[PDB]
Amino acid sequence: YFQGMVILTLNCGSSSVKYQVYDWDNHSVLASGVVERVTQPGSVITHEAKGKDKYVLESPCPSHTHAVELIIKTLTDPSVGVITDMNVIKAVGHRVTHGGDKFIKSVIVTPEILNTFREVQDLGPLHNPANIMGIEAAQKVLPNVPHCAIIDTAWHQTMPETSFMYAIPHEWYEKYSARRYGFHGTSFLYTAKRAAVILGKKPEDTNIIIAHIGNGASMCCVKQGKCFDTSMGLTPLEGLVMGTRSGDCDPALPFYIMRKTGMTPAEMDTALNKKSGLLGVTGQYVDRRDVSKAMGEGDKRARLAFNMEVYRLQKYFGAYIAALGQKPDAIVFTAGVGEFGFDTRLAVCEGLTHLGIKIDPKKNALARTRNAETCISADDSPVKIFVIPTDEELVMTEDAYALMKGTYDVHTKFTYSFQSPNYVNKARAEGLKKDLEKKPELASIVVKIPGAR
Amino acid sequence: YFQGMVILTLNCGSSSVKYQVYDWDNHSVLASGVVERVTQPGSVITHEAKGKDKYVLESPCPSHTHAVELIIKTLTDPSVGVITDMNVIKAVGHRVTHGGDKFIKSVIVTPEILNTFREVQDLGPLHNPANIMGIEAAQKVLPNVPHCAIIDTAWHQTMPETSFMYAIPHEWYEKYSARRYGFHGTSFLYTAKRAAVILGKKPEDTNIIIAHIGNGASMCCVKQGKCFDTSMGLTPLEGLVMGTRSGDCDPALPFYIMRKTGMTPAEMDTALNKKSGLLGVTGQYVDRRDVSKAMGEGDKRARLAFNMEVYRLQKYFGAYIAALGQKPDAIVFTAGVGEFGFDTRLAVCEGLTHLGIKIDPKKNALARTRNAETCISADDSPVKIFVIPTDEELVMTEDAYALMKGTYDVHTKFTYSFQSPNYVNKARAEGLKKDLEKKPELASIVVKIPGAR
Numbered sequence: 001y002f003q004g005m006v007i008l009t010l011n012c013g014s015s016s017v018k019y020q021v022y023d024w025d026n027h028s029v030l031a032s033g034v035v036e037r038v039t040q041p042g043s044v045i046t047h048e049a050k051g052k053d054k055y056v057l058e059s060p061c062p063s064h065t066h067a068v069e070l071i072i073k074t075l076t077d078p079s080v081g082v083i084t085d086m087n088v089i090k091a092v093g094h095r096v097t098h099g100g101d102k103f104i105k106s107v108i109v110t111p112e113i114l115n116t117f118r119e120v121q122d123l124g125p126l127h128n129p130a131n132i133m134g135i136e137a138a139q140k141v142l143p144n145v146p147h148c149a150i151i152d153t154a155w156h157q158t159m160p161e162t163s164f165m166y167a168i169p170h171e172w173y174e175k176y177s178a179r180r181y182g183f184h185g186t187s188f189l190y191t192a193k194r195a196a197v198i199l200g201k202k203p204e205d206t207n208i209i210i211a212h213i214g215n216g217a218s219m220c221c222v223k224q225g226k227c228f229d230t231s232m233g234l235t236p237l238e239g240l241v242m243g244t245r246s247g248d249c250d251p252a253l254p255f256y257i258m259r260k261t262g263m264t265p266a267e268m269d270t271a272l273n274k275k276s277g278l279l280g281v282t283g284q285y286v287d288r289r290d291v292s293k294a295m296g297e298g299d300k301r302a303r304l305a306f307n308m309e310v311y312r313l314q315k316y317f318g319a320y321i322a323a324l325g326q327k328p329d330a331i332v333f334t335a336g337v338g339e340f341g342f343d344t345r346l347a348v349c350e351g352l353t354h355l356g357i358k359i360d361p362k363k364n365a366l367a368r369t370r371n372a373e374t375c376i377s378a379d380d381s382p383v384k385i386f387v388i389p390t391d392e393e394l395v396m397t398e399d400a401y402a403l404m405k406g407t408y409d410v411h412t413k414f415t416y417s418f419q420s421p422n423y424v425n426k427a428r429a430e431g432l433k434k435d436l437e438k439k440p441e442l443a444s445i446v447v448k449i450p451g452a453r
Numbered sequence: 454y455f456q457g458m459v460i461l462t463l464n465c466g467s468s469s470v471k472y473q474v475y476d477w478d479n480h481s482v483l484a485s486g487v488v489e490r491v492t493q494p495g496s497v498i499t500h501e502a503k504g505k506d507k508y509v510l511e512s513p514c515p516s517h518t519h520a521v522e523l524i525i526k527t528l529t530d531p532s533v534g535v536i537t538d539m540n541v542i543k544a545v546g547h548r549v550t551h552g553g554d555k556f557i558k559s560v561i562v563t564p565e566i567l568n569t570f571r572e573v574q575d576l577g578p579l580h581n582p583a584n585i586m587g588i589e590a591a592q593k594v595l596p597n598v599p600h601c602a603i604i605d606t607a608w609h610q611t612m613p614e615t616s617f618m619y620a621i622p623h624e625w626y627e628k629y630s631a632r633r634y635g636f637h638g639t640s641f642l643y644t645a646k647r648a649a650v651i652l653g654k655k656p657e658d659t660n661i662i663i664a665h666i667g668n669g670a671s672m673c674c675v676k677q678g679k680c681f682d683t684s685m686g687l688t689p690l691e692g693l694v695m696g697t698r699s700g701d702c703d704p705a706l707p708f709y710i711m712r713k714t715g716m717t718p719a720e721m722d723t724a725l726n727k728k729s730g731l732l733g734v735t736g737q738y739v740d741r742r743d744v745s746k747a748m749g750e751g752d753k754r755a756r757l758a759f760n761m762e763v764y765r766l767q768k769y770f771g772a773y774i775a776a777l778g779q780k781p782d783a784i785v786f787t788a789g790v791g792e793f794g795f796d797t798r799l800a801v802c803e804g805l806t807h808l809g810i811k812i813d814p815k816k817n818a819l820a821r822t823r824n825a826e827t828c829i830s831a832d833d834s835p836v837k838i839f840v841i842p843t844d845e846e847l848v849m850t851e852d853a854y855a856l857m858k859g860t861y862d863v864h865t866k867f868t869y870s871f872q873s874p875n876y877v878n879k880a881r882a883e884g885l886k887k888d889l890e891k892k893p894e895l896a897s898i899v900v901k902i903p904g905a906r
C-alpha cells in the first residue's frame with residue numbers, strides 16, 4: 001500500500017527523546033523507541049520496529065540534535081529501519097508540557113510561536129526547556145515538514161475561572177498568570193472521547209471523571225464533554241499521590257521544612273517532585289508494583305503508601321462528583337496503574353458504593369491488560385466503571401496530521417478518528433488475541449460499543 | 454446564689470487578650486471582652502458585663518502581664534466589675550493553638566508541660582508564642598489557681614495515619630513531626646456533641662461533616678463520633694477559602710511567585726496568610742458581608758470570590774462524604790459565615806442535591822441568628838442540615854472546670870454538660886426571645902431535641 005503518509009511524534013526530556021512513527025494511511029505504529037542519556041556519556045537508542053526484535057545501539061548524543069539524527073538514521077536503516085528515507089515523514093508532533101493560557105489547542109510551530117512559548121517557559125521550568133530544545137533540534141534535521149506542538153495543558157483551558165483561580169492576590173494572576181493549569185491533557189482528551197463512544201453519547205452530553213494514574217497521576221472532571229476541574233495545578237506537583245511527587249500538601253509545610261533543613265526553593269521543589277510521593281512514604285519504592293508486592297510481604301510503609309494513594313483517589317472522586325452537580329455517567333481508570341492496578345481500583349471503588357460506584361470484583365481482576373477497553377462495574381451500578389488504556393501518541397499523531405492538512409481545531413469543533421464506534425487500534429487488537437488465548441474470560445468484560453459493526 | 458465557682462478563659466494573640474468569665478454553678482456568662490493593642494501604643498480594654506453598657510478604657514499594656522492585670526482590675530471594679538475579688542476565679546482556661554502530636558487532650562500547665570509546649574512551638578510559629586506568653590502572664594497574676602491549656606489541634610488527634618500523613622519523605626514526619634494537624638478543635642468538639650444530641654444518637658454512632666466557616670475556615674469529617682479527616686494542615690493555611698488565607702494551592706506556586714517577586718519564605722508565608730483568600734481575590738474585602746454586598750452591587754471580583762468559596766466547600770463536602778464510606782447523618786454549618794451566610798449555604802447545598810443534601814430555601818433564609826440551633830434541610834432530605842452556633846469558650850470553661858475537679862479526660866471517655874438534651878445556653882435563650890419577637894417564623898426551624906423536656 002501507499003506508505004508515504006507517516007507522522008513522527010517526539011517527547012523530549014532533559015536526558016531523553018522518546019519517539020513513535022505512525023503510518024496514517026495504513027493505521028499502524030511502524031516503530032517506537034527512546035534515546036536515553038542524551039547530553040550525557042553513554043547515550044543509547046532502544047528501537048522497537050513492528051514485527052522485529054528490539055535493537056539497541058550506543059552512539060554519543062551530546063545534544064538533542066544528535067539524538068534526533070540518531071533516531072532518523074535508525075528509522076531509515078536498510079536492516080533495522082521502517083521507512084525508506086526521511087522524506088517519508090510528512091509532519092512531526094512534539095510534546096510541549098506547558099502552554100500557559102496562551103495556547104488552547106495544538107499549533108504549527110513558527111518563530112513567533114516559539115517566542116510565545118518562551119513567554120510561558122517560567123510556568124513549566126522543569127519540562128518546557130527540553131521540549132523546546134527538541135523542537136529546535138528536529139527542525140534542523142527535518143526542515144521541510146511542519147513541526148507541531150501538542151500541549152499538555154491545552155485540554156484544560158476550558159476550565160471556568162471558579163475552578164482555575166487560586167485564592168491568592170489577583171495581581172499574581174494578572175501579572176504572572178498564576179492559576180491552575182493541569183496536565184495529562186492528551187490522555188484526558190483521548191480517554192474522554194473513547195468514554196463517549198463506549199457510552200453511545202455525543203461528547204457534549206457526557207459527564208465523567210477520569211483518573212490518569214501513571215507515575216505522574218491526575219484526575220479530570222469532564223462536565224458536558226469539557227474539562228471543568230483537574231487535580232494538578234500551576235505545575236504537575238498538585239493533587240493525587242504520585243511515584244515521587246507529593247501531590248496536595250499544606251503550602252506552608254515546605255517552609256517549616258526549609259527552616260528545619262536549610263534547603264532553598266529549587267531543592268525543596270526537587271524534594272517535593274523527586275523524593276516524595278510513594279518514594280517518600282516507603283523510603284525506596286516508586287513503582288506501584290513494588291508497593292503492592294511489598295505490602296503483600298508485610299511492609300508497613302508500603303501498606304501505608306498504598307492506602308494513602310487509595311484514600312486520596314476516593315476524596316478526589318467524591319469532590320468531582322460534587323463538582324459535576326449530578327451523578328457521573330461513568331468513571332474511567334487509565335495509564336499504567338489505572339490499567340493494571342486491580343487492587344488500587346478495588347480499594348478505591350469499594351469506598352464509593354454510596355456514591356453509585358459499584359465495582360464487580362471478578363470483572364476488575366480480569367482487567368489487567370493494555371490491549372482492551374473494559375467495563376468492570378457491576379451490571380446495575382448507577383455509575384459505569386471503565387478501564388480505557390490511553391493513547392497520548394495517537395492524539396499527537398492526529399493533531400499533527402490535521403494541522404498539516406489544515407482541518408485541525410479545538411476538540412469542541414473537531415472530530416477525531418477515535419470518536420468512531422468502529423475505530424480500531426491494530427497493535428492492541430493483536431495483543432488482545434494473545435491475551436484471550438491465555439485468559440479467555442477477559443472477552444466477557446471487553447466493552448460493547450453502541451453502533452459498532 | 455453561690456457565686457464562687459467562676460472560670461476565666463483567655464485567648465491571647467500577639468497584640469490582644471480576649472477574655473470571658475463564666476459562673477459555672479449559675480451557668481452564666483458574667484462578662485466578656487478584649488484588650489486590644491497589647492504591647493503597642495494605645496492599649497485599650499472593651500469590657501461587656503452582663504446587663505450593663507459596654508465599658509471602654511485606654512490603659513497602657515506594654516506586656517501581656519499588664520493586659521491580664523487590666524482585665525482582673527476591670528473584673529473586680531466595684532462599679533463596672535462582675536466579681537467581688539480575684540479569688541472568685543477558681544481556674545483559668547487558655548487557648549493554645551498547636552499541640553503537635555504531644556497533646557491529645559487538655560492539660561493543667563506545669564513547668565514540664567511548658568517545656569513540652571516549647572518543643573512544638575515551631576509547628577505553630579504564628580500563634581503559640583503569644584498563647585504561651587498569655588499563660589506565663591496569667592500565672593503571675595493568678596498564681597493560686599490551675600492554669601489549663603485547651604489545644605486547638607487536640608480534637609484531631611484521633612485521625613488515622615492514612616488521613617494525617619502527607620506523601621513526603623518519611624524522615625520529615627519522624628524527625629520534624631510534619632503531618633496534618635487541623636485546628637478549630639474546640640468548635641468541632643462542641644458542635645459534634647450538639648449534633649449528636651439533636652440527632653438523638655450516642656456520639657460514637659454519629660457520622661457527620663462540620664464546616665466551621667469563620668474568618669478562618671475549616672471542615673471536619675466526623676466518623677463514629679471522632680475526627681477522621683480535616684481540611685487545615687500542618688498549619689491553619691490549608692483547605693477552604695478564608696478571609697485572608699489562601700487555603701489549598703499547588704505547593705510549587707509560592708516558589709514560582711518567590712522567583713517572580715524576590716519574596717522570602719516568611720513574607721511568602723505572610724502573603725499566603727494575610728493577603729490571600731477573599732482579600733486577595735477581591736483586592737479589598739475580608740468579611741463575607743462585604744463580599745456579598747459587593748456582589749449584589751455588581752463587583753465581578755466579589756462575585757468570583759463568593760463562588761470560589763462555595764465551590765471549594767462543595768468539593769470538600771463531596772470529598773468527606775466519600776471519606777465517610779456512607780451517607781452522613783447530617784452536615785453542620787457553624788461560625789459566623791455558617792450561622793449568618795444564608796447565601797453561601799444555599800449555593801453550597803444546591804450543588805449537592807445528588808449527594809442527599811436538600812436544603813429548604815425558606816428555612817435557610819430564617820437561620821440568620823447566633824441564638825438558636827436550627828434545621829434547614831427539607832423535611833425528607835436524606836442528609837439533615839443543621840446550623841449550630843458554636844461555643845468554643847464553653848469547651849475551654851468546662852475543660853478547666855473538669856481538670857480542676859479531676860474528672861477531665863479525652864472526649865471518647867468524658868461527658869460534657871452540653872451533651873445533655875436539656876442543656877441550655879442562658880444568654881442565647883434570652884437573645885432568641887428577642888429574635889422571635891421580630892421574626893416569629895424562626896421558631897418553626899429551631900431544632901426539636903429527642904428526650905428534651
Ligand SMILES: Nc1ncnc2c1ncn2[C@@H]1O[C@H](COP(=O)(O)O)[C@@H](O)[C@H]1O
Binds near residue numbers: 243288
Ligand atoms: N502491573 C502493574 N500494576 C500496578 N501498577 C503498574 C503496573 N504496571 C505499571 N504500573 C505503574 O504504571 C506506571 C507507569 O504508568 P504510565 O505513566 O502510564 O507509563 C509505573 O510507574 C507503575 O507505577
Ligand SMILES: Nc1ncnc2c1ncn2[C@@H]1O[C@H](COP(=O)(O)O)[C@@H](O)[C@H]1O
Binds near residue numbers: 669739742789795
Ligand atoms: N451576617 C453575616 N453574613 C455573612 N458572614 C458573616 C456575618 N457576620 C459575620 N460573618 C463572617 O463571620 C466572620 C467571623 O466569624 P467567626 O470567626 O466565627 O467570628 C467574619 O469575618 C465574617 O466574614
